[PDB]
């Protein structure tokens, strides 16, 4: 799971809930 | 800087229940099936050949994938946490992609091996495991491992404060350290879609198509061998003319030496009237091409031949071999019935002919082929084997495509639909979480499904699973 920027905390939280892939 | 969302990111408990039941079933069934498959292949010296060792590599990849992908993702779904530290953060996705590589490259290798088994005439038939297959599998595993290295470099634990609460997150972190790893972070999911889905689908579909095209030619050979015999020595046909192979007329001259000189010309060596089966098969394939060219130059036969499927085309070529282009054209009403696809009507009409009266055994088999569009009237061991090989490759490839598509679509949808500036974007993120966990379960269902497909498609495996499990 990845995100464009660390400052997108919603995307990072999603990766925290997301599958490992 | 992207705004916070107006809505939550969450996974509903009802989905967690359903997804975890599926995960446990795929896990238990996949470990039993792939372990039993491996034990079948190791225990039976009769099961240790080229393709089954490739299947063993696939089964090991299945087990690796199931063990690395399901337990950790069940844990993430239920615990919503990462307790295992950075080393496991890197190792788990590394091993996961290695096992996917082994799976797709083993599938690719099997489709090529099955094609070679049909197409090669010099391949020695027997129980051996070729020297090259051993190095073939080592290379599959080394390549799969090397291609997964970016996962071990790119994943790491980061920390953030998220609306008050401190989180430790294992992910492919934004801001990679080198230019290559930055590019990997942005392209990874197109890379996985291309190299681990589209490319093996294209490769196996290509070799499957080459293989089934070749099997069609083998079937026509076996059909005419049954009906006209394979004669490796010059003989005289029913009209007294020197002939060889599968009804290949050499000359109408009464001189055996004249027939021998024609034969030597067509083979390119001094045969003294005796050829090999490989030589007869090449001769036969040219005779089929010539019969087809003649059929297409015949205004009465061409419309019929065009409209027929490949099997029924072979029955028409069969009749042309037996009675020539002009004789076959004489079946005016029967050819019309075939062109209109009135199979049962054409079959009853063809049985009223002088052709059926003179050679009823052969005509019955050709008529069955016209009636059914199958090779059933020519069923022998080679045909049963070819049907099973075809179904095995088709089924393995189809289940791969269906099982892995959802996870790739999930990652592609995020790439194409996610707008980090949208304050409502967490509804999409919550939906993507569901697709992602479904996608993991479907991908692992592939690993679980491969032993089941072999059980249903292969009589040899079906019985092997019976001995190992029902006793
Ligand atoms: C990371 C930098 C590059 C280093 C990368 C190399 C090191 C890791 C590779 C290991 C695979 C080695 C080959 C292992 C082959 C196992 C094949 C196998 O298990 O196949 C089962 C079959 O029954 C067989 O007969
Ligand atoms: C997202 C998609 C979900 C579903 C995706 C499928 C994965 C689960 C299926 C396992 C069985 C697969 C093997 C089924 C084989 C059919 C039986 C068969 O091939 O029989 C051949 C026989 O010799 C003449 O028909
Ligand atoms: C026994 C081997 C031969 C038979 C082969 C079939 C075996 C089926 C057994 C287990 C799969 C189903 C187990 C179900 C476990 C459910 C746990 C669960 O659902 O809890 C998650 C919950 O949502 C948390 O919030
Ligand atoms: C290198 C090889 C790695 C091999 C694989 C290592 C990872 C296995 C870890 C966990 C599996 C756990 C299976 C399911 C356990 C669920 C426990 C749980 O979810 O906790 C409940 C939570 O606290 C409710 O609030
Ligand atoms: C997206 C397209 C690239 C994807 C896979 C290439 C696989 C390359 C496997 C070899 C490893 C490359 C590597 O390790 O480079 C990292 C660099 O050293 C920084 O630390
Ligand atoms: C598929 C079954 C077999 C799987 C196992 C095969 C043997 C492992 C061999 C090579 C792996 C090499 C690991 C790559 C080196 C780690 C890179 C790394 O950790 O980078 C961190 C980065 O520098 C920030 O500190
Ligand atoms: C062997 C061929 C396999 C993969 C080659 C293709 C690798 C995929 C390259 C994708 C490059 C790319 O387009 O990444 C940027 C993307 O547009 C951002 O959303
Ligand atoms: C019958 C098999 C023929 C041989 C196989 C050929 C290669 C396989 C390539 C694609 C298959 C899956 C395609 C459908 C999957 C979705 C593609 C997609 O969503 O991409 C759209 C666009 O690129 C914005 O993302
Ligand atoms: C062998 C099959 C390889 C590729 C065919 C499928 C094409 C996959 C190409 C991936 C790169 C790509 O699609 O670029 C993304 C772009 O930004 C928007 O689609
Ligand atoms: C058996 C194999 C085939 C199964 C394949 C299953 C693939 C995923 C299913 C549905 C996704 C459909 C797309 C849903 C798009 C939702 C759009 C949305 O929620 O928001 C859009 C966003 O706001 C704009 O920026
Ligand atoms: C009492 C237990 C439930 C009753 C028995 C049910 C049987 C389940 C079988 C098929 C359902 C299909 C599952 C399809 C998964 C879609 C999940 C989903 O989309 O929910 C996301 C939601 O929007 C988050 O915000
Ligand atoms: C062998 C075959 C196995 C078959 C096994 C059963 C397959 C059921 C799968 C999907 C049905 C799901 C239907 C559509 C679910 C998504 C609809 C949707 O968009 O959800 C709204 C979203 O959650 C708003 O927040």
Numbering used by the authors:
A (entry chain B): 1 to 21
B (entry chain A): 86 to 303, 1000 to 1159, 311 to 403
Copied sentences from the primary study:
Three kinds of endothelins (ET-1, ET-2, and ET-3) activate the endothelin receptors (ETRs) with sub-nanomolar affinities.
The EC50 and Emax values of ET-3 for the ETB receptor were similar to those of ET-1 in both assays, while the EC50 value for ETA was about 5-fold lower. These data indicate that ET-3 functions as a full agonist for the endothelin receptors, with moderate ETB-selectivity. Despite these sequence differences, the N-terminal regions are similarly accommodated in the orthosteric pocket in both structures, because these bulky residues are exposed to the solvent and interact poorly with the receptor. The high-resolution ET-3-bound structure allowed more accurate tracing of the elongated N-terminal residues, as compared with the ET-1-bound structure, and revealed more extensive interactions with the agonist peptide. P88, I94, Y247ECL2, and K248ECL2 form a lid over ET-3, which is stabilized by a water-mediated hydrogen bonding network among the carbonyl oxygen of P93, the side chains of Y247ECL2 and K248ECL2, and D8 of ET-3. The W3366.48 side chain moves downward by about 2.5 Å, resulting in the disruption of the water-mediated hydrogen bond with D1472.50, and consequently, the D1472.50 side chain moves downward by about 3 Å and forms hydrogen bonds with the N3827.49 and N1191.50 side chains. The N3787.45 side chain also moves downward by about 1.5 Å and forms a hydrogen bond with the nitrogen atom of the W3366.48 side chain.
